[PDB]
Amino acid sequence: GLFGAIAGFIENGWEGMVDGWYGFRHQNAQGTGQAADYKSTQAAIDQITGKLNRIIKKTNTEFESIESEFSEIDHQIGNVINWTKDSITDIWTYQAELLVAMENQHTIDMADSEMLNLYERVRKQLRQNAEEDGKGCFEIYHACDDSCMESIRNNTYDHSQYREEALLNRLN
Amino acid sequence: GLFGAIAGFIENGWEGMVDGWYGFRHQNAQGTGQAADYKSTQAAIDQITGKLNRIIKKTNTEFESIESEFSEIDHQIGNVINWTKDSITDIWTYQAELLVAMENQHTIDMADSEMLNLYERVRKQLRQNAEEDGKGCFEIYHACDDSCMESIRNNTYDHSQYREEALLNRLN
Amino acid sequence: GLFGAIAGFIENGWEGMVDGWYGFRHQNAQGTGQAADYKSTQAAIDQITGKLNRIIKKTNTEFESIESEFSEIDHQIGNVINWTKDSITDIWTYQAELLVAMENQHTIDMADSEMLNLYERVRKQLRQNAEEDGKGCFEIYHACDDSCMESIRNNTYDHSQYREEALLNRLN
Amino acid sequence: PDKICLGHHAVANGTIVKTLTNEQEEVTNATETVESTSLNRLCMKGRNHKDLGNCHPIGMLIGTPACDLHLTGTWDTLIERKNAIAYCYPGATVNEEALRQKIMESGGISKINTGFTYGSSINSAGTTKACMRNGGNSFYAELKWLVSKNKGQNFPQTTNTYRNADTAEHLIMWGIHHPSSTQEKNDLYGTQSLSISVGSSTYKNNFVPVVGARPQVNGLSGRIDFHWTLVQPGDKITFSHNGGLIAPSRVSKLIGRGLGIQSEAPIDNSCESKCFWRGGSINTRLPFQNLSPRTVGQCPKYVNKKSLMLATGMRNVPE
Amino acid sequence: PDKICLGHHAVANGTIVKTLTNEQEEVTNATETVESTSLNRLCMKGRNHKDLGNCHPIGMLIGTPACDLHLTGTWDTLIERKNAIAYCYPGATVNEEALRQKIMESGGISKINTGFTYGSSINSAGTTKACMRNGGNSFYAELKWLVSKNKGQNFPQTTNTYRNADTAEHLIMWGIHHPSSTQEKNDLYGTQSLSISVGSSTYKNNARPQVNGLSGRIDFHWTLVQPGDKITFSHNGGLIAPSRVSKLIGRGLGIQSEAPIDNSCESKCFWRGGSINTRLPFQNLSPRTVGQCPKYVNKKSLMLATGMRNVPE
Amino acid sequence: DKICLGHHAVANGTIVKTLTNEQEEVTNATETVESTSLNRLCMKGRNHKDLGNCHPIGMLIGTPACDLHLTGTWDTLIERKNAIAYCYPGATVNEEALRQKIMESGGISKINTGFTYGSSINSAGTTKACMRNGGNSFYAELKWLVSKNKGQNFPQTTNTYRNADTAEHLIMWGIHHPSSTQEKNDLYGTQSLSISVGSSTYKNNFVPVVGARPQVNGLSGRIDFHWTLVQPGDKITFSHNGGLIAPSRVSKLIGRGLGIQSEAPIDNSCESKCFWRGGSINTRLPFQNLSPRTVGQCPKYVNKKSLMLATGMRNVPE
Numbered sequence A, B, C: 001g002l003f004g005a006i007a008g009f010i011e012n013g014w015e016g017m018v019d020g021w022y023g024f025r026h027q028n029a030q031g032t033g034q035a036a037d038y039k040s041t042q043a044a045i046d047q048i049t050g051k052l053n054r055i056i057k058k059t060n061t062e063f064e065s066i067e068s069e070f071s072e073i074d075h076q077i078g079n080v081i082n083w084t085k086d087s088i089t090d091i092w093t094y095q096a097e098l099l100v101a102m103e104n105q106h107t108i109d110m111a112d113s114e115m116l117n118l119y120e121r122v123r124k125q126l127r128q129n130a131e132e133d134g135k136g137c138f139e140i141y142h143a144c145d146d147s148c149m150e151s152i153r154n155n156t157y158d159h160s161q162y163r164e165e166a167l168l169n170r171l172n
Numbered sequence D: 001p002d003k004i005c006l007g008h009h010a011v012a013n014g015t016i017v018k019t020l021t022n023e024q025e026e027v028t029n030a031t032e033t034v035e036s037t038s039l040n041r042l043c044m045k046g047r048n049h050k051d052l053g054n055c056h057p058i059g060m061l062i063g064t065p066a067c068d069l070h071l072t073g074t075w076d077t078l079i080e081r082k083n084a085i086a087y088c089y090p091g092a093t094v095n096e097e098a099l100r101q102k103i104m105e106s107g108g109i110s111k112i113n114t115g116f117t118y119g120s121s122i123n124s125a126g127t128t129k130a131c132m133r134n135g136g137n138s139f140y141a142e143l144k145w146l147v148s149k150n151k152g153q154n155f156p157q158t159t160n161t162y163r164n165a166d167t168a169e170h171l172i173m174w175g176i177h178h179p180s181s182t183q184e185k186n187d188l189y190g191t192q193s194l195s196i197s198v199g200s201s202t203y204k205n206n207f208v209p210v211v212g213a214r215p216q217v218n219g220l221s222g223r224i225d226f227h228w229t230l231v232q233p234g235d236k237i238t239f240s241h242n243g244g245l246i247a248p249s250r251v252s253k254l255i256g257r258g259l260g261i262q263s264e265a266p267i268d269n270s271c272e273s274k275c276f277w278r279g280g281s282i283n284t285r286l287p288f289q290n291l292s293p294r295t296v297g298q299c300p301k302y303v304n305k306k307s308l309m310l311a312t313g314m315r316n317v318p319e
Numbered sequence E: 001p002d003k004i005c006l007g008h009h010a011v012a013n014g015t016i017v018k019t020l021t022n023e024q025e026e027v028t029n030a031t032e033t034v035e036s037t038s039l040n041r042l043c044m045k046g047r048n049h050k051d052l053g054n055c056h057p058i059g060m061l062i063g064t065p066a067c068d069l070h071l072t073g074t075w076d077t078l079i080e081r082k083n084a085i086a087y088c089y090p091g092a093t094v095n096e097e098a099l100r101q102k103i104m105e106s107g108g109i110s111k112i113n114t115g116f117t118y119g120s121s122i123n124s125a126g127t128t129k130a131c132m133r134n135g136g137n138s139f140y141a142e143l144k145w146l147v148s149k150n151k152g153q154n155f156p157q158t159t160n161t162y163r164n165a166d167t168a169e170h171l172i173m174w175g176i177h178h179p180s181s182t183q184e185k186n187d188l189y190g191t192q193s194l195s196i197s198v199g200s201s202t203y204k205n206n207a208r209p210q211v212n213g214l215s216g217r218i219d220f221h222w223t224l225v226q227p228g229d230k231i232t233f234s235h236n237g238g239l240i241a242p243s244r245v246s247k248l249i250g251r252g253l254g255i256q257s258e259a260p261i262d263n264s265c266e267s268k269c270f271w272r273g274g275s276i277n278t279r280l281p282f283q284n285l286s287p288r289t290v291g292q293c294p295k296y297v298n299k300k301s302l303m304l305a306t307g308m309r310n311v312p313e
Numbered sequence F: 001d002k003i004c005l006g007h008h009a010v011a012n013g014t015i016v017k018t019l020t021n022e023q024e025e026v027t028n029a030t031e032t033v034e035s036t037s038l039n040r041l042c043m044k045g046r047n048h049k050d051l052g053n054c055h056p057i058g059m060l061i062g063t064p065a066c067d068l069h070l071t072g073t074w075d076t077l078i079e080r081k082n083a084i085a086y087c088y089p090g091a092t093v094n095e096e097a098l099r100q101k102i103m104e105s106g107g108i109s110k111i112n113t114g115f116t117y118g119s120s121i122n123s124a125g126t127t128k129a130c131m132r133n134g135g136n137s138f139y140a141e142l143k144w145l146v147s148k149n150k151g152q153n154f155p156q157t158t159n160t161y162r163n164a165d166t167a168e169h170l171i172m173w174g175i176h177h178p179s180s181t182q183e184k185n186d187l188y189g190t191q192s193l194s195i196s197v198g199s200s201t202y203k204n205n206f207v208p209v210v211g212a213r214p215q216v217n218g219l220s221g222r223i224d225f226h227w228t229l230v231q232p233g234d235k236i237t238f239s240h241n242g243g244l245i246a247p248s249r250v251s252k253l254i255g256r257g258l259g260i261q262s263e264a265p266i267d268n269s270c271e272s273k274c275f276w277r278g279g280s281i282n283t284r285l286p287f288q289n290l291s292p293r294t295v296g297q298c299p300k301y302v303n304k305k306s307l308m309l310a311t312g313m314r315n316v317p318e
């Protein structure tokens, strides 16, 4: 898609992730872990809730009957009414198809952008202590335990602490 | 936002910046400086001027009166006219709300994209002589005086001149 | 543009490229080469084919005549018909202008995004073996022959093979 | 080296939606924007409503037997039904659809006595077998069939005038009897040339009974055609007739405003609704609807579309 | 160092399109969305059609000579032409435009005999030079001009009644002859006072130039007779009586056009000037169209981009 | 050393709506819906005609109030509230169609019918309803035909107007409906009254309705007006035996113009292309919430107080 993350450089989604829309998986010495990112998940849901508030709505305009259901109306004005209603219906059918098509395009791309924005936030945090694998993972060039992994997710990772160790492991 | 710069990795805007929409602040040995980026500011304004030219407009179609202000109209055609006008008004009200909502979304995101594009232009210029601070700043790993800072803003910075000094300061 | 690649950090397009929308040019010891990227070219064409399928289409609604071509109609209902048709025509003219304007904006930006996505795919492949020249090229810091260049285009380049040579040439 | 991987959720059973670019786009979740299901009921909770059943709205003004329980009332909603009776005796109303729309637009009907009196040479109690009431011959409750007291004798030149004493417009209806033969006409209103004149400030008209053979309808070749006008406050309306006039004993007043539904659906006083059609009520919060283009009230817009799915989640990419 | 460059195609001759932002945006390729060209033909392939030529739709119900090949038929499309003849003998139809619209909406016409018979004192074969057929004087095919058999004699008091035996509404038409002198009237229908009465369940009713050298006038009236219902004509002379009633079958598309027929091309959209065959969604030919049509727009051109921004060398 | 990238901000930002957010603060925004009106008719660059107390239909039949408007040219015609069409009580059949046709026109010219009458007819019938120069008068473009001797039969008369011009003419006539049988006998005699009108494309019969009705300006009588177009070269024939109000002049509608129904006073200083009951609309904005009843080249009516269009980025202050 537009931002190249979802159905892009991230191969597939995680069916096993049920407590969030976006999140992290890690591997270190101590083993494996999964966690959802709250901020990114909520930003996406709040934007979709916004669309629904705007679209799931009718006009409060009161319309009366201009055609009788049970009696015959004048043939000439009947033809005018039939022409006008069919014309209005063609406009609303077109507007409905376009609205939903356009919104669906935006929803898919907005969701793609929130994934990319989380990825870029992490890349910038890790600075020179990690490198990108092209599948959405960062290879970290220092011992990163569950506290360190938690500090990346919570946006409190200090790159300067591990820089010396990391730069040596990267150059080898 | 879509591009993750404005109300994203850049914490807030600068009220002190009045001669442009986007620009630079620097700190070096000799002290502090502010400057506006003309190209990025104008690209954003020219795109908004374009929207206004297209939207701030009426049709040149001449409409006559079909309902009298000062006399009584036939009840049946009066009901048909009332139904048609209310239907047309519901279409224009919907189209107006959607146009402005859709344009506002595009304006906000287009402005976000021009910020990101300037950031990416600078990142690529500085090459291996600088690192990203994650908050929209580049930490430059060499003595960069007001001439050097001016050459970054004017897109005439030659990375190869400062590479030796920069690579040594980065590896430490 | 939104994604900053086409009419952005890539100075101009290639008239000499006729077998694709996006692709690569390389220079090495053995000489020069051009090649089209199939996946990115097809992703762009398939999206445009999608728009044409949705837009190049008519309603199946059957309309009868409400104005006689060869006889004079009642002046009052004639004015109502004229008012309704002009109102419907103003709606369709507006919807037509907006649809095409909006789609053209999306097409231009979607095409920009596919260029950027290919650029990002290559950047991530080359990892630490190359640097960005800022004009859409990667300077590769190792002997890269026609097999190596072909492996970048075919997404089978293994960075680890050339890392040692590349890291030495970069640090100098 | 230690790894941290970023990813998004997915689901096994995703939904297909349309985009600008793709007609078959799988997403994690989607919601419908077009209503396809109807309630075959009229949701009349919070509404002072009136089901006319077998009574046609015009029957309320002239007082057909079938309409005896609907001669007066107040309502915010009036429900008209299929094959509702307006005329017991064969005939029609000039500007029928305009009158029906005006009643269906009203929020109630009140009746006012005309006070019309007639000479001893006139019989005001003319009845027919077409309009049965309590098993015996009767007539329209709000009208009187004026005939010569002695068969064959000339109907006397009569003048009746109704003044609108109220502060609102009144709806006066009257009938013109068209007999089927010259013999019938002579028996009821005499041998003279018949002329009925009606005049107000804003209305004026003349009516001549059309005599001539025509088919039987409920075994009657006679016709009573109905006419109507509005009499404004303070204005008078004068009837000059020499026989053939079906004269109003009561005039009608339409009170306030209300919503007129034409439906076959039965009433339900439990559910609430603001949108109605022939087939029932529409309660959806959805913006669009493919039930009928003929609706009344505050309604979702009709579209020529079975389904329009709006995505409520990202692209679904499973393994 | 070895370099690998990313790039996009371009063309020398690019196309200008409009965007939300820019009125003069050059792209590699674009396609038109508004049709500007028309075919001055009626594309009638795959359509069971009927070109009435010089026959006016109302002529089909009363049977004017010009309409002899159009007294019955079925069609999905009916084409009416300019200055088409409805009346051979001078006169007009009450509610003319209502009747015309009803026929032009129909998908065919079938005829049913009234069965009307008349006494030996009546001549049913009254003819005129206005309505020529096979070189000889004739009359409207579906009507009969009733006149006294002996010139000057009183036309007898006659009653004719048509019952709708069918399961669909029938369209009955009749004429009233208005002669131009008292002498003419006396010769045809006698010296008595003339009265024509028409009655059904839902219907009841009772100086000028020369036109083709005739001040005489036959004015036409019409009503619908519902299934099972009867319509009774009481007349003492002056009635032009129906020999056949009409039935309008199903639905069809009515075109009023001057354009000639072409049975080779197909179309679903028509106007006065011809057919519109485009796959395009919009059209600036006419706001007056019939069928399944592209929408009319006040726009010469609307170019839809089918390629990226063009940035040439 | 640091180089930091950033965007401008403002203390007082504006709230706009987006697809996603109802409360989105931006640096700047502009209104797209006009709420303010000018209570004036901006008539600069327009050859206009304020009919004041004269109703458009009054121009064709020639009511006293319309004496200054019997002919003229204009690109714009202004009709007012409570404008007089009929001095003598009565109405026009197809009134609204005729009014719309006049309001659509760009001027009116008059042509004499040339209609002459026998010595047994009085053409100078007048009334107190239509006062002119302090004395009883009648519609300027019509003549009230009555029997010269009270009670006597009005003679069978034929009048025919031929359209000698190369454009359609609008002919109007009246039918008098007296209030009593006694009144009818005095004016047009004891006989049965019939008025026949016939052209190529038009034909009709009218019978005076006699019968008691209320007084309007102290008159129970009614004169109802009828009208048709007579095409070039075509003739229209009036056959009458009393009750016809006959035209002395026919009308010709010239070119095209814009018809305004407004109470607002004229201003010849300002220009406008859009008008309503309440005045003129000069805005460049595409939408408007003043009235759904407008005429000319107008912004579209919307059920919306305000619609703010963003003209700047998201506002994120410090």
Ligand SMILES: CC(=O)N[C@@H]1[C@@H](O)[C@H](O[C@@H]2O[C@H](CO[C@]3(C(=O)O)C[C@H](O)[C@@H](NC(C)=O)[C@H]([C@H](O)[C@H](O)CO)O3)[C@H](O)[C@H](O)[C@H]2O)[C@@H](CO)O[C@H]1O
Binding pocket: D125, D126, D127, D128, D129, D130, D137, D145, D147, D179, D180, D184, D188, D219, D220, D221, D222, D223
């Ligand atoms: C008893 C009586 O008053 N009249 C007898 C005639 O009605 C009868 O002719 C037959 O009439 C039948 C219809 O009868 C009514 C009706 O509609 O019920 C009887 C009403 O009293 C009468 N009402 C008034 C106010 O006049 C009414 C009215 O005349 C007509 O409906 C006017 O159209 O008629 C039925 O139509 C039969 O087909 C018809 O032959 C004659 C002969 O039997 O005797 C009368 O005494």
Ligand SMILES: CC(=O)N[C@@H]1[C@@H](O)[C@H](O[C@@H]2O[C@H](CO[C@]3(C(=O)O)C[C@H](O)[C@@H](NC(C)=O)[C@H]([C@H](O)[C@H](O)CO)O3)[C@H](O)[C@H](O)[C@H]2O)[C@@H](CO)O[C@H]1O
Binding pocket: F125, F126, F127, F128, F129, F144, F146, F177, F178, F179, F183, F186, F187, F218, F219, F220, F221, F222
């Ligand atoms: C001379 C005559 O025949 N009748 C006179 C009566 O009209 C009059 O009663 C008064 O009549 C008043 C109306 O008078 C006019 C009018 O409009 O002013 C006089 C006009 O000359 C006459 N015009 C014509 C062409 O005949 C006109 C017309 O007859 C009617 O309007 C037709 O409906 O009437 C008014 O109604 C008064 O309220 C009424 O008392 C009496 C007393 O003078 O006798 C005759 O003089």
Ligand SMILES: CC(=O)N[C@H]1[C@H]([C@H](O)[C@H](O)CO)O[C@@](OC[C@H]2O[C@@H](O)[C@H](O)[C@@H](O)[C@H]2O)(C(=O)O)C[C@@H]1O
Binding pocket: E126, E127, E128, E129, E130, E137, E145, E147, E179, E180, E184, E188, E213, E214, E215, E216
């Ligand atoms: C049914 C019948 O008697 N038809 C007549 C017909 C009509 O009576 C006539 O149209 C009534 O106006 O007239 C026909 O002759 C008319 C013909 O007569 C010439 O002598 C004279 O030059 C003209 O009046 C001319 O119209 C006719 O054919 O129309 C005879 C027909 O038998």
Ligand SMILES: *[C@@H]1O[C@H](CO)[C@@H](O)[C@H](O)[C@H]1NC(C)=O
Binding pocket: A075, A078, A079, A082, E105
């Ligand atoms: C109007 O539309 C309905 C749709 O079925 C149709 O039944 C009706 O006959 C139409 N009226 C005319 C006059 O075409």
Ligand SMILES: *[C@@H]1O[C@H](CO)[C@@H](O)[C@H](O)[C@H]1NC(C)=O
Binding pocket: B074, B075, B076, B078, B079, B082
């Ligand atoms: C049309 O709308 C106006 C104003 O909203 C209202 O006063 C009028 O009654 C309506 N007309 C009819 C015929 O109902």
Ligand SMILES: *[C@@H]1O[C@H](CO)[C@@H](O)[C@H](O)[C@H]1NC(C)=O
Binding pocket: C074, C075, C076, C078, C079, C082
């Ligand atoms: C309606 O518009 C057409 C445009 O050609 C015009 O010819 C016609 O006279 C107009 N009708 C009325 C009643 O204004």
Ligand SMILES: *[C@@H]1O[C@H](CO)[C@@H](O)[C@H](O)[C@H]1NC(C)=O
Binding pocket: D029, D030, D031, D312
């Ligand atoms: C799917 O969409 C519906 C409708 O908006 C919503 O209520 C629900 O939360 C969604 N389901 C899941 C599993 O997210």
Ligand SMILES: *[C@@H]1O[C@H](CO)[C@@H](O)[C@H](O)[C@H]1NC(C)=O
Binding pocket: B052, F028, F029, F030, F311
């Ligand atoms: C705010 O918007 C308006 C409308 O585009 C513009 O004219 C004005 O100059 C803008 N103000 C600033 C401070 O940019």
Ligand SMILES: [Ca+2]
Binding pocket: B064, C079, C082, F104
């Ligand atoms: Ca017009």
